[PDB]
Amino acid sequence: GVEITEGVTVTAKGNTEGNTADLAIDGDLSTYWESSNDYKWIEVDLGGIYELSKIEIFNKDEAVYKYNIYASEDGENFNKIAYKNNDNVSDSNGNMHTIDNVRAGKIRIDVVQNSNSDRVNIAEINVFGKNTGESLPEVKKIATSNFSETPWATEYEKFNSDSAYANEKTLNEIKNLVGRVIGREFKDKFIFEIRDQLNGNDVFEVSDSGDGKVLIKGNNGVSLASGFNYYLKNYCNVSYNPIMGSNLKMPETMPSVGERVVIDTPYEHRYALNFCTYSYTMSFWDWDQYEEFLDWCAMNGVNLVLDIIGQEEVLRRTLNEFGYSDEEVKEFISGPAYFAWFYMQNMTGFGGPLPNDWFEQRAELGRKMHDRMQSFGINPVLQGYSGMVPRDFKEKNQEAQTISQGGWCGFDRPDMLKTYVNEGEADYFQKVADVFYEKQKEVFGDVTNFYGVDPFHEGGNTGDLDNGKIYEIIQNKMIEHDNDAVWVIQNWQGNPSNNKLEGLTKKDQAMVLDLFSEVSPDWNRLEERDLPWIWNMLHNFGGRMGMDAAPEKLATEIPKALANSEHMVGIGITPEAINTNPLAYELLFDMAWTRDQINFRTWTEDYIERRYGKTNKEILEAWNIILDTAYKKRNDYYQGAAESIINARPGFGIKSASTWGHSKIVYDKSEFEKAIEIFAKNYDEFKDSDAFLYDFADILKQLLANSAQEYYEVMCNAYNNGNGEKFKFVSGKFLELIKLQERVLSTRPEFLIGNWIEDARTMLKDSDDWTKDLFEFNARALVTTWGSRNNADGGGLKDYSNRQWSGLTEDYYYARWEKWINGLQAELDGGAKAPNIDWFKMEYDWVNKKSDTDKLYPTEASNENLGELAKIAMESYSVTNMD
Ligand SMILES: CC(=O)N[C@H]1CN[C@H](CO)[C@@H](O)[C@@H]1O
Numbered sequence: 001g002v003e004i005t006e007g008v009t010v011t012a013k014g015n016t017e018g019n020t021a022d023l024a025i026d027g028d029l030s031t032y033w034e035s036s037n038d039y040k041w042i043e044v045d046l047g048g049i050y051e052l053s054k055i056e057i058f059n060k061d062e063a064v065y066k067y068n069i070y071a072s073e074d075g076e077n078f079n080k081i082a083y084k085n086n087d088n089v090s091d092s093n094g095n096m097h098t099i100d101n102v103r104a105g106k107i108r109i110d111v112v113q114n115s116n117s118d119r120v121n122i123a124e125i126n127v128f129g130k131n132t133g134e135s136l137p138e139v140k141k142i143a144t145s146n147f148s149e150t151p152w153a154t155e156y157e158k159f160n161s162d163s164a165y166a167n168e169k170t171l172n173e174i175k176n177l178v179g180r181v182i183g184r185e186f187k188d189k190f191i192f193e194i195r196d197q198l199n200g201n202d203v204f205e206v207s208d209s210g211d212g213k214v215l216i217k218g219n220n221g222v223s224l225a226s227g228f229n230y231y232l233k234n235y236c237n238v239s240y241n242p243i244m245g246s247n248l249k250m251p252e253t254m255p256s257v258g259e260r261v262v263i264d265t266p267y268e269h270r271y272a273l274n275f276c277t278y279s280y281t282m283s284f285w286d287w288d289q290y291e292e293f294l295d296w297c298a299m300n301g302v303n304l305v306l307d308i309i310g311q312e313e314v315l316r317r318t319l320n321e322f323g324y325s326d327e328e329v330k331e332f333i334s335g336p337a338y339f340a341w342f343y344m345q346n347m348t349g350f351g352g353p354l355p356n357d358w359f360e361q362r363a364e365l366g367r368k369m370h371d372r373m374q375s376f377g378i379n380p381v382l383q384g385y386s387g388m389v390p391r392d393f394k395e396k397n398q399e400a401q402t403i404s405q406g407g408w409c410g411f412d413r414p415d416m417l418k419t420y421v422n423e424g425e426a427d428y429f430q431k432v433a434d435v436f437y438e439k440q441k442e443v444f445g446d447v448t449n450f451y452g453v454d455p456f457h458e459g460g461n462t463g464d465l466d467n468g469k470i471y472e473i474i475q476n477k478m479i480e481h482d483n484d485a486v487w488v489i490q491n492w493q494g495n496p497s498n499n500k501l502e503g504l505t506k507k508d509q510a511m512v513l514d515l516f517s518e519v520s521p522d523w524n525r526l527e528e529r530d531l532p533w534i535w536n537m538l539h540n541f542g543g544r545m546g547m548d549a550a551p552e553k554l555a556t557e558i559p560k561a562l563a564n565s566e567h568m569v570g571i572g573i574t575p576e577a578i579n580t581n582p583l584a585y586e587l588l589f590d591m592a593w594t595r596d597q598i599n600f601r602t603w604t605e606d607y608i609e610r611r612y613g614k615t616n617k618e619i620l621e622a623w624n625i626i627l628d629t630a631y632k633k634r635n636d637y638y639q640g641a642a643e644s645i646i647n648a649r650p651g652f653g654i655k656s657a658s659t660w661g662h663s664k665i666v667y668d669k670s671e672f673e674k675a676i677e678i679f680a681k682n683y684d685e686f687k688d689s690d691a692f693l694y695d696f697a698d699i700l701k702q703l704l705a706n707s708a709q710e711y712y713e714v715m716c717n718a719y720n721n722g723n724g725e726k727f728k729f730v731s732g733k734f735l736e737l738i739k740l741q742e743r744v745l746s747t748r749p750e751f752l753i754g755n756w757i758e759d760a761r762t763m764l765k766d767s768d769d770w771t772k773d774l775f776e777f778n779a780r781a782l783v784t785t786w787g788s789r790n791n792a793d794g795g796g797l798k799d800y801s802n803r804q805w806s807g808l809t810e811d812y813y814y815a816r817w818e819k820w821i822n823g824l825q826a827e828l829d830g831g832a833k834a835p836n837i838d839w840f841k842m843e844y845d846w847v848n849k850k851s852d853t854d855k856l857y858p859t860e861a862s863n864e865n866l867g868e869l870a871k872i873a874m875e876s877y878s879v880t881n882m883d
């Protein structure tokens with residue numbers, strides 16, 4: 001006591017009606033607030049700062065409810081003060097939570113589970129507290145800097161206008177890159193020089209200085225970094241991949257170049273990044289990770305990178321001009337794990353709202369990135385505008401004409417402004433596009449000529465509009481704000497259609513990304529229409545893992561397409577995540593520096609030696625087996641690596657874990673296993689190489705995925721055929737195979753869910769518990785259910801981003817299979833019939849757990865011996881000895 005029984009109010013961000021926020025606080029147990037959407041929390045204001053001692057919660061029924069409670073004394077930071085996570089039913093007595101006399105002027109109650117419904121409810125909440133006679137501070141409004149007012153603008157224009165200073169900046173930066181990549185002690189071993197292009201082509205040179213140093217030339221930063229990487233690869237037996245394993249062991253003394261090389265590239269652009277990459281991989285990156293990525297980019301020849309960092313701030317400024325408060329902008333914008341699908345006009349709100357601190361920090365990080373890109377000569381691809389608006393835009397802007405875009409995977413797509421209207425009508429496309437490009441100037445300045453936007457990505461609705469005319473006006477509006485603008489358009493599954501593309505009246509000022517050139521090339525339509533286009537290796541879908549690459553097509557199809565085209569202005573990568581198969585990415589970027597088809601077999605041989613720091617006859621044969629199996633050329637259509645059955649929702653006739661995925665292994669399994677035998681045989685010799693271990697974990701977990709499939713098939717034959725003792729035995733081995741897999745996965749820092757979760761929880765500083773918990777939800781949801789019930793199930797997104805990850809395998813994948821088995825056993829043993837499992841409910845239970853109250857996943861890899869684990873795999877859990 002005493003009960004705060006006066007002056008209290010409540011807000012909510014959604015409700016079924018008329019089950020509205022205030023009904024949670026009316027002193028009436030028969031009336032209740034109930035959620036309608038994914039905002040499953042209410043905010044209660046206490047009429048002043050109290051020292052809470054108790055909070056009492058009643059629900060509308062007797063279901064099992066789980067919730068987390070947060071308080072704020074400053075009006076900004078909401079910290080967790082209490083929670084219910086036990087499995088007790090609610091009853092007429094309510095739940096009483098003892099508080100330790102915490103100062104609170106506001107409280108948040110986030111009901112994360114209702115065992116009975118997708119909706120949550122609070123019938124009543126009483127708060128018990130001592131009045132401090134204080135009030136909450138006024139919360140400060142979001143205030144960001146204008147680019148021109150910042151130290152960033154001065155630097156940007158100084159570099160821009162001053163050759164000598166720009167050259168000095170660039171050369172000193174490449175020096176810094178050397179120190180970051182191989183070590184500070186090697187910096188002074190290189191001399192870097194700016195030269196001209198080679199017949200209008202980007203170009204580098206590697207030669208001796210005369211006094212034992214390496215002299216590297218290049219027309220810009222990326223050429224210089226590419227020359228630095230050429231030298232390491234071809235003279236030092238060194239290989240750099242900050243994400244997927246390196247060998248950075250330098251020779252004791254710097255090896256001579258001998259004959260000077262001059263290497264040019266026929267491609268104006270080398271492109272990197274899907275919109276999805278920003279979500280599946282980069283959601284929770286800090287500057288350390290970004291800087292490290294741009295170093296790897298520059299070193300692989302990349303000079304065109306997609307960039308959406310801080311675009312939340314650009315849009316906030318845009319929407320503020322058209323009737324939207326900052327709270328409403330925050331409700332529009334998704335959480336930090338979802339920006340790919342938010343900027344692709346597919347989904348809103350989900351994972352949000354972002355903290356207020358978000359905007360300033362992200363604008364700053366993007367400003368930082370453009371400074372570094374400027375030194376290298378990497379063009380960012382900023383945002384274009386195509387008419388995207390919230391669904392309530394007309395409400396707030398009545399003369400506005402809009403087009404409803406329908407659903408995407410159970411999500412409500414944002415609206416789209418009519419790209420043109422009739423005479424006599426207000427043209428809001430022109431109004432919002434004018435503000436949008438203007439505001440993107442104010443945040444970042446004139447940093448780029450390349451702008452990316454993609455109306456009607458994976459659905460939508462063109463309404464009454466002419467398809468060509470839509471693309472004409474989008475481009476003409478873009479060129480109006482930058483006369484040198486190039487519209488970067490994705491080419492995904494035959495869209496945009498030809499007649500949309502024919503509406504582009506300035507062909508040289510668009511550039512189409514052929515997204516999936518290595519499985520499903522679709523550039524001939526673009527080439528015929530004289531559109532500048534880029535050949536891209538997509539490769540990776542959703543971050544889903546497995547041994548999968550197309551190195552032969554990369555080594556042949558790229559130069560072939562150059563020879564057979566006039567408008568191929570580049571090559572690139574469009575992966576949905578960068579987490580898998582480094583060979584694939586190194587070869588693609590290596591193909592920029594050649595006009596001829598190469599030998600993918602001898603390129604691998606060379607590759608593996610510099611990646612491991614050494615090679616032998618046996619390692620080579622193991623890799624040839626891989627080239628002959630998992631990496632063997634194929635001519636069918638498929639999206640990513642063949643999927644592991646371990647990662648699939650349990651059932652009969654499973655042919656995938658994700659909706660558009662595939663689990664059919666197209667190579668001989670016993671033949672692939674030979675690679676693992678050879679790796680285990682050579683483990684002791686090669687365990688000094690971290691990239692060897694990484695590659696060994698990759699093939700071994702592939703082996704167990706492969707054999708898991710066979711054991712799965714045998715065990716549900718056993719169920720179907722009535723036995724019995726058989727099913728139990730085979731299902732026993734299946735679960736044990738997963739426990740061995742889990743140990744294989746504990747070995748790599750990159751396979752740890754704890755790194756993923758912690759990165760999310762700590763990506764900002766000064767964060768409250770509310771924000772950390774919410775960013776953890778984003779991290780957990782993405783790799784599992786993706787959205788909520790209607791996105792996971794009806795929307796088809798269940799386990800789209802399934803990861804063969806430690807912790808996730810123990811507590812999610814293994815748990816599902818164990819239950820299903822447990823399960824069919826109770827049936828087969830004279831019980832049951834086995835009930836229908838509501839899988840989403842089980843998956844979403846894990847999604848909503850918090851690291852600081854439930855279980856904290858490790859950020860430290862284990863010392864398990866992959867050679868030993870491999871022996872156990874071959875002996876006990878293989879196809880070869882399967883029986
Ligand atoms: C849910 C998801 O990630 N969907 C992606 C499917 N593949 C397309 C091509 O990369 C993407 O545009 C979608 O966002």
Ligand SMILES: [Ca+2]
Pocket residue numbers: 023024025026027028029030031032033122123124
């Ligand atoms: Ca009530």
